[model samples]
Structures are given as C-alpha cells and as structure tokens.
Target: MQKVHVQYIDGETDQMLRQDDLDGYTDETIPYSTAEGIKKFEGDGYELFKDNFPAGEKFDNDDTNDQFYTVIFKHHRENVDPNHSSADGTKGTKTLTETVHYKYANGTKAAEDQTAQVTFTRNGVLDDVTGIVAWGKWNEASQSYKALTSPTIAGYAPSEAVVKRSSNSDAEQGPTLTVIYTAD
Candidate 1:
C-alpha cells in the first residue's frame, strides 16, 4: 500500500506526520474532510492548504504515487532589548570616567593631561578596561591593584588607583575608577 505523508513547516523547524500514525487513517488515499485527516495536524497562527489549492479536498496516494502535503505556518518575529530590565521595568546605564592625572615628582600637577569616558550597561559585572593601559581592578584579598602594563609612558609609573561606586546596588551608574601615574 502507498503511504500518505503530511509535512508541517513552522519557521525553521519541520515536522512530518503519516496517515497511519495520525488517527489510524491508514488508507493510501483519504479525503481531507475525514476526521483522521483533519486530526493529523494542529497548531496556532497557521492554515492548511492542499497541493497549492485552498483547504478542503481529497488526497490520493495509490501504489503508483505516494502523496505528500505541505502545511505552512505563520510566525511573528519580534526584537528584544537585552539591556531592558524586566523585573522593575526600568532601563540601566553606566558611565566609566577615567581621569588620568599627571603629576611632577614634587606632587604638583603637570601640563599634559589624558582622560577617557566609556558608556556601558549596568549589568552587575566588572567591565574590562583593557584598552585603557593604566586602568586596573582592585584585588581585595591581595590588597593590591593590578594594572595593565602595555602602553606605558616612559618615566611614568602607576602610583595609585581608586574605584568609587556611586550606588551600592548592582544596577547603578558611576563605578568610575581613576588611575594616577606619577613621574619616576
């Protein structure tokens, strides 16, 4: 006996149903109006059509020809903002202001200056500032600050670094840190 097959396509996922397995409609040819054929597939936001024609018709699957039917389903795609907070329905923002203060050996300010401002999402995690050579993180257990060594200016070394959190909460702005370099 020829087998009748039903192919369901939903977005990128596909599912196939056989007449024998779906409601025991094992006949090689069956009418679409039959209870078994109608029960073969079910879903939301989708309509069934037979052989590019409108729904409601008979499908033939004799020994000379196995029948195949395609069911196209409609799907609505949506865009989501990762930074938006679902818990409180609020959005968070962060700004890292790195103020590089140059000083003379006598602790007097120098003429040359450099600074950086970076915007980030307040995601409760330390943002990597590897691009800023002097910036580093405070290691609480070690009681030391680790600074990136590259892009070091001659005659200058990292003297002190400070990170100040404007708010104690995880989702807040201005955990701005400053790295001060002094003439060596």
Candidate 2:
C-alpha cells in the first residue's frame, strides 16, 4: 500500500464561545456574527494544526511534515439560508475551490496545485449569492488530522467547515481542498 500522508486545513478562532447581551429584550435569539453558527452548534468542527500539540510531544516539525505531502481539505455547508428562510428557496447552491502549493526539490512547481472543491444545494429565489469559507491545517488540539495531508473526516463534510447556504435544496453536498507537495 502507498503510505500517503495528509492533513485537514480549516478555520480557527481564538474566540469559541459566543456571547450576546440583550439588555432590554427578554425573549430574544441573537443571530450569528457569520454563517458558522449552525455547524458549531451541530457538534461538527475542526482546528488549525499549527497550534495542536500535547504537553511533552511539542516537536516543532509541523510545517516540515506538511511540506512533504499533498493535502486535501473537504467540507460542506448544507441547509444554508442567509435570509433565515427554509432550507430550499429560489437561490441555488454553490461550490468553492481552494488549492495548496507544492515546491519540488529542483525548485520547480507542479503543473496543477493540489485542490479541494465543495458542492452543495440551495432553494432560494436569488440569482447572486455569497458566503465566507474559512480553512487551514489541522492540529492535534482539534484532533482533525491523520498524518500529513489527509484529514480524518474523509466523506462526512469536515468538522472544520462552516458553510453558509443562501438558499436550499434536497441534495448531498460538501467541499474538497487538495495540497500539492514535493516528490519523494
């Protein structure tokens, strides 16, 4: 078997807990600062690998290992609606793509950098829709990695992704990101 290394690149934030101060209102639910609220609450998430380490195993070889393999990060944001409407609306779904860079020993670059693409559905009545995507390398703190470039969440839409759906539809969806690396 080919010994393939991999890691997951997703979003990170120093602030995990969300706090809201509704001084005058009693029964009020605050909206998210962004679209990640749904995922965070759903118990699916990922962490940056740069900051993941145990107490004694803090060996600074993260970047060194990361540079050795091709990484692919994948995720999916479903049931998204910026308007806070139903899951499916007039607006359709979207796909996002991101690529990782690879440098060869000869100082040459790969023809195509490794890449990840996300696919999902939407059912809103809007033509133009937009959302934010946060991604980075997975770390031990988050326990989201397998080796170098491959992530733990292979098919279940990564825990590290917080997809914002401006519309809705009945379909399976997710995102994928690939990293290009040097040859052995």
Candidate 3:
C-alpha cells in the first residue's frame, strides 16, 4: 500500500535561536522565513505525494486538513553556550526540537484545538491536480476565505479559527468577527 507522506520545510519562524549553529540543520530542515516559503513547501510535498500516489485524490475538506505537514519549531537560547563545548568533546551547539504533524484534510478533522475541543467546518473546492485540493471556506460577513471547519454555522469555530500555514499566521490566527466593525 502506498501512503502520502508530508515533509515540513523551514519549520520555525521568529524563533530567537539561529538555524546555522544547529548541527545537522539546513534551511530545508528548519522553518521558512516567508509566506512564499510555506507555500513552496506545501507545493513540494504535494508533488512528492503525487509521485508516490499517481491516482491521489483531492480531499473534500480544505487543504489545511489534507496530506499537509505542520512544524512546531522551538529553540532555547538558554541552551546556547558561547564557550561551552559538547560533553562528548565536540563543538558547542544549541538544542532545537521540531514537532511535525500530518493531516489529510479528512472530514472528521476540519479544525483542531489543543484545548476547549473546538471543531469548525470548511467549505472548499478541490484542485484538479489529482493530489490534494486547496479547499477554502467562505465567511459571509467578512466575505473572504476564512479557513475551513467542521461546523456549518457562523461563529462556531474557535477563537483561533483560521489555520496556520506558518508561524506568522498561526501565531495570530483566530475566530471570525460576528458583526461588521463591532467593537469588542
């Protein structure tokens, strides 16, 4: 059986630690710096999936859930040692860990929240690439692509409604506004 494998490129953004100092680390190994980088990463993973599964099909839900890779990058500046050498007699190095998650845009997992158990429904269209489709749901009030969820109604999604493709968007991505220009 063939399986779709998603790889994360450029996993962390805005992290205080630098990637250059980390051994066995490369630009492709860590998080990307720009939105374009995230998109390219997705595109590359999609291509790889297609190669593995020539008849790969588009997921009914948004691309956020389907055959996608997510990276949670963490760097501890405290772990850095200016003059400290490795315990094994190697050069000093910083400690970095990456958390990668994979989802294939399945209907059951439209939106995932670490806490509060919130799920939002997304209405998306599938691209004809025979791999994964970029499904985007509509926000009637804002009139934009507000990301997908499990719910069909408005304001049901969590406060952090929009899905994060990169650290920048996810850091601030949250629920949609109910009323137009209504002050909190």
Candidate 4:
C-alpha cells in the first residue's frame, strides 16, 4: 500500500503546533489521510513527523528519509491603536507660516515678512499637508499623539507641534499645530 509521511516546521521554538495548523493543509496522504493526520497533529505545539513506509522498501542507513514530508507554519499578532477617534474622526486643522527676518552683522533686528497660511485637517485620517498627508491618532492612555507626521516645508524648519482643540476629548477637534520657520 502506498503511504505518505508529513512533517511540520516552525520558526518559533516556544510555540507548539495547534489544531488550527491542520486547517491550512488540504493535500492527500497515505494510510493516515490528511484528515486523520490533522487529528494527530493537533494539540502538540512541537514539530512532528508521520510515515507509513511500504514493507518492501529498503531501510538505508543514510539519513535520506524520503518518506517524511515537511510543512512550515507562521504566526503573527497585531495591536490596534486605542486613540483612534470613532466619531467623524475629524481632529481639526493646523496652520503653517513662514517668516523671513533680515539681520545685520551688528546687534540689529530687522523687519519680518509673513507668508501665506497653509491649513491641515486632522479627521483621524491622513490629510494633505504641503504635498504629504498630515494626520495622526491620539493615544489616551499615553496622553500623546501617535499618528502625526511632521509636515515637509521647502525652506523652513518646524517648531514643536501645538495642539489647539475645543476640548481634550478624542472626538473633539484635536489641535491646530503651527509650523514657524525663520529665515535670515
């Protein structure tokens, strides 16, 4: 009778094989069919092998175990951002301004030029800000903003983002951070 053997491999040495592992296998096998193998593979989180070699097959002393079939398993975990706003998710807007200040070698202060105001929205989603989207979520427990990407400005460096919202709640308009750049 033709028989099939199976082996399971995993990178995580700490985690053992489980019933769910068998769900991904649909191929056929010998005496112990795929269904039967799944039953035997379940519960044990460790690597395993099964074989029903034919009686006449010569048992070579070599490690070439042709009867053994191998299967690799992978597992992953993900964390959801708790600060994600559930409402309109519209946090608010941020304004960016550029100021050019001319100064002399002497201890002298010159006038400053005010540029146009660029606006950004924080609707719990990614919004465009000077070619790149400026959006982020707030972490309540950490009391911090987790999704804010600094806006890219051509010639000005940004200052610490300032939050200007109606309320401190997550659903409320978050903040309107200002980016001020000074050029000499």
Better of 2 and 3 by TM-score: 2
Cα error of candidate 4 at position 22, Å:
17
Question: How displaced is residue 13 in candidate 2, in Å?
Answer: 42
Angstrom error of the Cα, residue 164, model 2: value is 20
- The TM-score obtained by model 4 is 0.22
Tens-digit lDDT track for model 1 on 62-166?
A: 456655555544333222233433333434444444444555566565434454444443332211111111212221211112232323557777554333223
Model 3 lDDT tens row, 147-173: 333223343333233332212112223
RMSD of each: 14.6, 29.3, 28.6, 16.2
Q: Residue 116 in model 3: shift from native, Å?
A: 1.5
Give per-candidate clash totals.
Answer: 0, 39, 21, 8
On lDDT, the leading prediction is 1
Candidate 1: segments with Cα more than 4 A from true spot: 10-54, 73-75, 82-99, 105-184
lDDT of 2 at 98: 39
TM-scores for all candidates: the values are 0.33, 0.20, 0.15, 0.22
**Whole-model lDDT values for every prediction:** 0.39, 0.30, 0.28, 0.35
**What does candidate 4's lDDT look like per residue over 38-86, in tens digits?**
4444333222343333333332333433344444433322232333333
Name the regions of candidate 3 deviating beyond 4 angstroms.
1-115, 138-184
Instruction: Work out how many backbone clashes candidate 4 has.
Output: 8
